[PDB]
């Protein structure tokens, strides 16, 4: 009948360079450690490999002189099976609105993972590079590397995240109250972050400090653009 979308007019500088398609991958963005402030940038590069896995839909409620008032707080995971995962929390008066608020927030907070090998090479990394940890308020995880074909040996909660990450082999162990899973999953996600923030002898050679996209593509942005 009537056709054509028009969606996503950027109000963000970084968003405009993507929309004009002078930034060709997310990998450039992460290398300059920029914020991402829009949820359509990620959904432009990807959007046909991102799945969601709604973990829990948890009530909370406070007390007032007229009685209870309940809001629903849901956690929603996100990730494609090539190395990018994310996670988000949001709460709202009702259910569906809170879920849809979290599916947006999880895309925003998406990060890459670094995968590595066991003790020898045959191509295609299958496991975690080094033995790392991640803590969120008395919960911690100890992601330990593992040989091929052992599968992910973990509890149900981190087994979601690590499987979406493409980390197919891992040994784990938990410590502390894992019953309150909001800590447990955020502590897993904390660990998965540290993989590119862990220094290894590979990375000891010095970087060349290539010029920023902000600098090079500034010529199009001298019109009125911000």
């Amino acid at each position: 009948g009537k056709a054509g979308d028009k969606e996503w007019l950027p109000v963000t500088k970084l968003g405009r360079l993507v929309k004009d398609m002078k930034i060709k991958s997310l990998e450039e963005i992460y290398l300059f450690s920029l914020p991402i402030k829009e949820s359509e940038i990620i959904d432009f590069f990807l959007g046909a490999a991102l799945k969601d896995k709604v973990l829990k839909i948890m009530p909370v409620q406070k007390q007032t002189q007229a009685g209870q008032r309940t809001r629903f707080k849901a956690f929603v995971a996100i990730g494609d099976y090539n190395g990018h995962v994310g996670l988000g929390m949001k709460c709202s008066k009702e259910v569906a609105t809170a879920i849809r608020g979290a599916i947006i927030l999880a895309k925003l907070s998406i990060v890459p993972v670094r995968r590595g090998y066991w003790g020898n090479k045959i191509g295609k990394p299958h496991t975690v590079r080094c033995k790392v940890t991640g803590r969120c308020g008395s919960v911690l995880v100890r992601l330990i590397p593992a040989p091929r074909g052992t599968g992910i040996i973990s509890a149900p909660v981190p087994k979601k995240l690590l499987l979406m990450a493409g980390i197919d082999d891992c040994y784990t162990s938990a410590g502390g109250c894992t019953a309150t899973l909001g800590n447990f999953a955020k502590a897993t996600f904390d660990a998965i972050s540290k993989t590119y923030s862990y220094l290894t002898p590979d990375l000891w050679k010095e970087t060349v400090f290539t010029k920023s996209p902000y600098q090079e593509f500034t010529d199009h942005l001298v019109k009125t653009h911000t």
Binding site: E27, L31, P112, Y117, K121, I122, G123, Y196, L203, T207
Partner: peptide, 14 residues
């Protein structure tokens, strides 16, 4: 790797 093929989605800056 075995090939010397370079892996890791981005090589971070130091």
């Amino acid at each position: 790797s075995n090939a010397g093929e370079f892996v890791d989605l981005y090589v971070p800056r130091k």
